[PDB]
Amino acid sequence: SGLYVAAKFSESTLDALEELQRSLKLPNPVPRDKLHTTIVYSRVNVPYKVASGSFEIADKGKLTVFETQSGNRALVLEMDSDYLSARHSYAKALGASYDYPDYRPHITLSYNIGVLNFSGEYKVPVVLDREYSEELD
């Protein structure tokens, strides 16, 4: 099948992301166990080696709406992360594909904000706990 890789976060990072969701009163918030950042979304599978260790990968981000393929207005925290961009480029160097114009690392915070709008720039220590790799439907 395809390949999906994402990063999961430390307990302190998850606490900060849930605080952001609660403080903004977001509808349809992503559950704590589901918070993540996609690295690889490839229709082809390659032997990507998940990372080992834990460390900070971003210290800030900006809110943006990323429409989903079903037409939902999802709200995300968009980051500039040398680490995540380098891991995406590692997957590409191994042969993975990414059928979108650009890779823009982000953490989805709400699945669907309806007609609402949200704007902001946030300081959040984003600490990688682990990466996971799995088959993509």
Author numbering: 1 to 137
What did the paper state?
The cyclic oligonucleotide-based antiphage signalling system (CBASS) and the pyrimidine cyclase system for antiphage resistance (Pycsar) are antiphage defence systems in diverse bacteria that use cyclic nucleotide signals to induce cell death and prevent viral propagation. Here we show that phages encode anti-CBASS (Acb) and anti-Pycsar (Apyc) proteins that counteract defence by specifically degrading cyclic nucleotide signals that activate host immunity. Using a biochemical screen of 57 phages in Escherichia coli and Bacillus subtilis, we discover Acb1 from phage T4 and Apyc1 from phage SBSphiJ as founding members of distinct families of immune evasion proteins. We confirmed the critical role for Apyc1 metal-coordinating residues and identified E74 and Y112 from the opposing protomer as further catalytic residues required for cCMP hydrolysis and release of the reaction product 5′-CMP. Together, these findings demonstrate that Acb1 and Apyc1 constitute separate families of immune evasion proteins and explain the distinct reaction mechanisms that degrade CBASS or Pycsar cyclic nucleotide signals.
We next determined crystal structures of Acb1 to define the mechanism of anti-CBASS evasion. Structures of Acb1 from the Erwinia phage FBB1 in the apo state (1.1 Å) and in complex with 3′3′-cGAMP (1.2 Å) reveal that Acb1 adopts a compact 2H phosphoesterase fold with six central β-strands that form a U-shaped ligand-binding pocket. On substrate recognition, the flexible carboxy-terminal residues 145–152 form an ordered lid that closes over the top of the captured 3′3′-cGAMP ligand. Recombinant T4 Acb1 rapidly degrades the CBASS signals 3′3′-cGAMP, cUA and cAAA, but does not cleave cGG, demonstrating that Acb1 is responsible for the broad cyclic nucleotide hydrolysis activity observed in T4-infected cell lysate. The broad specificity of Acb1 allows evasion of diverse CBASS operons with a single gene, and the ability of Acb1 to cleave cyclic trinucleotide species suggests that this enzyme may also enable evasion of type III CRISPR systems that use cAAA signals.
